[PDB]
mmCIF file of C-alpha atoms in Angstrom:
data_model
loop_
_atom_site.group_PDB
_atom_site.id
_atom_site.type_symbol
_atom_site.label_atom_id
_atom_site.label_comp_id
_atom_site.label_asym_id
_atom_site.label_seq_id
_atom_site.Cartn_x
_atom_site.Cartn_y
_atom_site.Cartn_z
ATOM 1 C CA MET A 3 27.953 16.764 45.108
ATOM 2 C CA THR A 4 31.278 18.324 45.028
ATOM 3 C CA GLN A 5 33.009 21.401 42.803
ATOM 4 C CA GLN A 6 35.155 18.812 41.008
ATOM 5 C CA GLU A 7 32.113 16.902 39.790
ATOM 6 C CA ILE A 8 30.519 20.235 39.541
ATOM 7 C CA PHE A 9 33.623 21.316 36.992
ATOM 8 C CA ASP A 10 33.735 17.851 35.292
ATOM 9 C CA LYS A 11 29.794 18.108 34.891
ATOM 10 C CA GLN A 12 30.236 21.886 33.209
ATOM 11 C CA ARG A 13 33.246 20.940 31.334
ATOM 12 C CA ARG A 14 31.301 18.069 29.536
ATOM 13 C CA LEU A 15 28.208 20.647 29.242
ATOM 14 C CA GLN A 16 30.339 22.774 27.176
ATOM 15 C CA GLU A 17 31.738 20.008 25.020
ATOM 16 C CA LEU A 18 28.370 18.804 24.249
ATOM 17 C CA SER A 19 26.924 22.486 23.740
ATOM 18 C CA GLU A 20 29.295 23.102 21.026
ATOM 19 C CA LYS A 21 28.318 19.933 19.361
ATOM 20 C CA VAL A 22 24.615 20.766 19.262
ATOM 21 C CA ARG A 23 25.633 24.296 17.884
ATOM 22 C CA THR A 24 27.411 22.384 15.196
ATOM 23 C CA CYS A 25 24.779 20.527 14.498
ATOM 24 C CA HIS A 26 22.478 23.498 14.335
ATOM 25 C CA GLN A 27 24.384 25.020 12.104
ATOM 26 C CA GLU A 28 24.548 22.064 9.554
ATOM 27 C CA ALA A 29 21.003 21.001 10.024
ATOM 28 C CA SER A 30 19.772 24.662 9.301
ATOM 29 C CA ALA A 31 22.124 25.227 6.375
ATOM 30 C CA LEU A 32 20.726 22.054 4.666
ATOM 31 C CA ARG A 33 17.276 22.827 5.296
ATOM 32 C CA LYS A 34 17.972 26.087 3.419
ATOM 33 C CA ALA A 35 19.384 23.889 0.541
ATOM 34 C CA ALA A 36 16.712 21.494 0.137
ATOM 35 C CA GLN A 37 13.925 24.619 0.450
ATOM 36 C CA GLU A 38 15.880 26.639 -2.444
ATOM 37 C CA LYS A 39 16.226 23.424 -4.784
ATOM 38 C CA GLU A 40 12.717 22.745 -4.247
ATOM 39 C CA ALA A 41 11.885 26.192 -5.209
ATOM 40 C CA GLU A 42 14.208 25.532 -8.298
ATOM 41 C CA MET A 43 12.619 22.258 -9.205
ATOM 42 C CA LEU A 44 8.994 24.430 -8.999
ATOM 43 C CA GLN A 45 10.563 27.055 -11.186
ATOM 44 C CA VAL A 46 11.469 24.433 -13.739
ATOM 45 C CA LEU A 47 8.045 22.999 -13.702
ATOM 46 C CA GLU A 48 6.789 26.884 -14.570
ATOM 47 C CA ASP A 49 9.064 26.963 -16.977
ATOM 48 C CA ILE A 50 7.795 23.984 -18.251
ATOM 49 C CA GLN A 51 4.265 25.555 -18.555
ATOM 50 C CA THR A 52 6.233 28.795 -20.146
ATOM 51 C CA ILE A 53 7.118 26.488 -23.470
ATOM 52 C CA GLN B 5 -6.615 12.615 -27.431
ATOM 53 C CA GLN B 6 -9.155 14.170 -24.942
ATOM 54 C CA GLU B 7 -7.139 11.776 -22.022
ATOM 55 C CA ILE B 8 -3.666 13.611 -23.114
ATOM 56 C CA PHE B 9 -4.997 17.012 -22.309
ATOM 57 C CA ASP B 10 -6.773 15.392 -19.068
ATOM 58 C CA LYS B 11 -3.657 13.765 -18.186
ATOM 59 C CA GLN B 12 -2.143 17.603 -18.565
ATOM 60 C CA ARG B 13 -4.700 18.534 -16.145
ATOM 61 C CA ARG B 14 -3.949 15.918 -13.608
ATOM 62 C CA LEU B 15 -0.294 16.839 -14.283
ATOM 63 C CA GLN B 16 -1.131 20.366 -13.192
ATOM 64 C CA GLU B 17 -3.115 19.437 -10.185
ATOM 65 C CA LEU B 18 -0.056 17.185 -9.148
ATOM 66 C CA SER B 19 2.528 20.093 -9.390
ATOM 67 C CA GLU B 20 0.035 22.229 -7.135
ATOM 68 C CA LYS B 21 -0.023 19.358 -4.802
ATOM 69 C CA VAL B 22 4.031 19.702 -4.917
ATOM 70 C CA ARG B 23 3.693 23.271 -4.371
ATOM 71 C CA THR B 24 1.419 22.563 -1.382
ATOM 72 C CA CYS B 25 4.105 20.128 -0.088
ATOM 73 C CA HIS B 26 7.011 22.929 -0.618
ATOM 74 C CA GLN B 27 5.019 25.429 1.323
ATOM 75 C CA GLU B 28 4.263 23.418 4.153
ATOM 76 C CA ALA B 29 7.989 22.013 4.239
ATOM 77 C CA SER B 30 9.046 25.686 4.215
ATOM 78 C CA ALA B 31 6.637 26.616 7.375
ATOM 79 C CA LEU B 32 8.462 23.559 9.309
ATOM 80 C CA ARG B 33 11.969 24.477 8.498
ATOM 81 C CA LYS B 34 11.161 28.207 9.563
ATOM 82 C CA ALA B 35 9.582 26.735 12.671
ATOM 83 C CA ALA B 36 12.618 24.280 13.351
ATOM 84 C CA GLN B 37 14.803 27.409 12.667
ATOM 85 C CA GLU B 38 12.937 29.310 15.620
ATOM 86 C CA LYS B 39 12.638 26.106 17.975
ATOM 87 C CA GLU B 40 16.336 24.812 17.738
ATOM 88 C CA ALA B 41 17.518 28.896 18.159
ATOM 89 C CA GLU B 42 15.286 29.300 21.557
ATOM 90 C CA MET B 43 17.455 25.678 23.190
ATOM 91 C CA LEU B 44 20.986 26.775 21.714
ATOM 92 C CA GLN B 45 20.616 30.182 23.213
ATOM 93 C CA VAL B 46 19.884 27.905 26.553
ATOM 94 C CA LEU B 47 23.309 26.019 26.265
ATOM 95 C CA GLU B 48 24.886 28.958 25.650
ATOM 96 C CA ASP B 49 23.221 30.544 28.692
ATOM 97 C CA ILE B 50 24.763 27.223 30.275
ATOM 98 C CA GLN B 51 27.821 28.843 29.570
ATOM 99 C CA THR B 52 28.503 30.667 32.624
ATOM 100 C CA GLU C 7 21.707 25.468 39.126
ATOM 101 C CA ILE C 8 22.686 23.100 35.834
ATOM 102 C CA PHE C 9 20.080 20.353 36.836
ATOM 103 C CA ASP C 10 17.225 23.318 36.333
ATOM 104 C CA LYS C 11 19.061 24.470 32.868
ATOM 105 C CA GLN C 12 19.172 20.242 31.857
ATOM 106 C CA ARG C 13 15.188 20.604 32.669
ATOM 107 C CA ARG C 14 14.475 23.633 30.495
ATOM 108 C CA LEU C 15 16.637 22.247 27.733
ATOM 109 C CA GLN C 16 14.781 19.006 27.772
ATOM 110 C CA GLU C 17 11.335 20.553 27.483
ATOM 111 C CA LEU C 18 12.616 22.243 24.320
ATOM 112 C CA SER C 19 14.494 18.955 22.978
ATOM 113 C CA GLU C 20 11.282 17.765 22.740
ATOM 114 C CA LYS C 21 9.585 20.627 20.823
ATOM 115 C CA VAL C 22 12.431 20.034 18.571
ATOM 116 C CA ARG C 23 11.836 16.570 18.372
ATOM 117 C CA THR C 24 8.039 16.944 17.646
ATOM 118 C CA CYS C 25 8.768 19.403 14.824
ATOM 119 C CA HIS C 26 11.570 16.823 13.705
ATOM 120 C CA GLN C 27 9.409 13.983 13.580
ATOM 121 C CA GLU C 28 6.304 16.425 11.572
ATOM 122 C CA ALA C 29 9.146 17.294 8.955
ATOM 123 C CA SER C 30 10.058 13.793 8.788
ATOM 124 C CA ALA C 31 6.879 12.744 7.367
ATOM 125 C CA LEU C 32 6.524 15.404 5.388
ATOM 126 C CA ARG C 33 9.783 14.610 3.669
ATOM 127 C CA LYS C 34 9.006 11.028 2.569
ATOM 128 C CA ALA C 35 5.536 12.041 1.544
ATOM 129 C CA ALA C 36 7.178 15.190 -0.799
ATOM 130 C CA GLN C 37 9.757 12.589 -2.538
ATOM 131 C CA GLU C 38 6.991 10.550 -3.312
ATOM 132 C CA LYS C 39 4.428 13.126 -4.485
ATOM 133 C CA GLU C 40 7.289 14.659 -6.518
ATOM 134 C CA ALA C 41 7.596 11.316 -7.835
ATOM 135 C CA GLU C 42 4.044 10.778 -8.935
ATOM 136 C CA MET C 43 4.348 14.235 -10.614
ATOM 137 C CA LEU C 44 7.439 13.027 -12.564
ATOM 138 C CA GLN C 45 6.187 9.624 -13.327
ATOM 139 C CA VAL C 46 3.093 11.404 -14.646
ATOM 140 C CA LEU C 47 5.459 13.845 -16.460
ATOM 141 C CA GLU C 48 7.215 11.014 -18.045
ATOM 142 C CA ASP C 49 4.036 9.202 -19.339
ATOM 143 C CA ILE C 50 2.555 11.849 -20.994
ATOM 144 C CA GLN C 51 5.705 12.243 -23.602
ATOM 145 C CA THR C 52 5.347 8.394 -24.028
ATOM 146 C CA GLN D 6 9.079 24.320 -37.428
ATOM 147 C CA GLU D 7 9.828 25.413 -33.946
ATOM 148 C CA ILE D 8 8.503 22.065 -32.458
ATOM 149 C CA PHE D 9 12.221 20.575 -32.446
ATOM 150 C CA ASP D 10 13.552 23.186 -30.473
ATOM 151 C CA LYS D 11 10.839 22.958 -28.159
ATOM 152 C CA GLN D 12 10.999 19.148 -28.031
ATOM 153 C CA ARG D 13 14.424 19.177 -26.872
ATOM 154 C CA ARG D 14 13.582 22.026 -24.445
ATOM 155 C CA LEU D 15 10.732 19.762 -22.983
ATOM 156 C CA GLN D 16 12.970 17.143 -22.740
ATOM 157 C CA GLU D 17 15.965 19.040 -21.089
ATOM 158 C CA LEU D 18 13.935 20.656 -18.309
ATOM 159 C CA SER D 19 12.040 17.588 -18.126
ATOM 160 C CA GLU D 20 15.203 15.746 -17.125
ATOM 161 C CA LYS D 21 16.058 19.166 -15.200
ATOM 162 C CA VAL D 22 13.006 18.459 -12.809
ATOM 163 C CA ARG D 23 13.985 15.103 -12.344
ATOM 164 C CA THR D 24 17.570 15.444 -11.255
ATOM 165 C CA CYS D 25 15.849 18.225 -9.001
ATOM 166 C CA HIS D 26 14.049 15.952 -7.451
ATOM 167 C CA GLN D 27 16.738 13.491 -6.234
ATOM 168 C CA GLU D 28 18.837 16.488 -5.436
ATOM 169 C CA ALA D 29 16.209 17.775 -3.387
ATOM 170 C CA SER D 30 14.953 14.283 -1.801
ATOM 171 C CA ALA D 31 19.070 13.757 -0.761
ATOM 172 C CA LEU D 32 19.613 16.942 0.408
ATOM 173 C CA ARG D 33 15.919 16.425 2.632
ATOM 174 C CA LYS D 34 17.527 13.482 3.939
ATOM 175 C CA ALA D 35 20.834 14.942 4.872
ATOM 176 C CA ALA D 36 18.918 16.874 7.207
ATOM 177 C CA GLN D 37 16.730 14.379 8.936
ATOM 178 C CA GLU D 38 20.110 12.749 9.601
ATOM 179 C CA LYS D 39 21.716 16.137 11.071
ATOM 180 C CA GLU D 40 18.388 16.399 13.198
ATOM 181 C CA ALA D 41 18.773 13.152 14.197
ATOM 182 C CA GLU D 42 22.450 13.695 15.124
ATOM 183 C CA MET D 43 21.558 16.718 17.364
ATOM 184 C CA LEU D 44 18.741 15.043 19.163
ATOM 185 C CA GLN D 45 21.194 12.052 19.883
ATOM 186 C CA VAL D 46 23.796 14.672 21.562
ATOM 187 C CA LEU D 47 20.956 16.261 23.280
ATOM 188 C CA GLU D 48 19.980 13.050 25.053
ATOM 189 C CA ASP D 49 23.293 12.640 26.161
ATOM 190 C CA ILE D 50 22.957 16.332 27.975
ATOM 191 C CA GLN D 51 20.333 14.550 29.993
ATOM 192 C CA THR D 52 22.714 12.006 31.100
ATOM 193 C CA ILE D 53 24.890 14.961 32.289
#
């Protein structure tokens, strides 16, 4: 229960918070890519139906 | 024969099912984007 | 202070997990449904 | 005699759907791994 421990704990939170943010960016990008790819696939299906 | 036409109808229903899956997945992705954005703000709020 | 923020993060973390588990199940089902649609799409052209 | 071109298009597009399925699946699988990775880090925050 001291400032040293407080400073350490805060230092770790910031490092882990950064990690979490990175993971958020990557995951979001992957999800969007999946979305667009699915849309593409459906569009190719519609193209098969067209001819 | 009739079965081949029936297979085409089944293919259509399958495609529609896939479309449904895609829409639901879209909803879940948007929800995930919203939910993660709020907690990421809490982490940025922990800073400071 | 920091402990309170940990509890708030814990609240939202369980929400993200639930949304994650829900999406994971749909991902498996989406792949299978597409595979069947493809399997049908392959058999129709003999 | 447009059937030869149409049949070639049907085959090619079918293959394209098959590849888009594989690519989508891998991207979805990659997304799940990242979410799992994110959650594991969030567990570390609970540990302080």
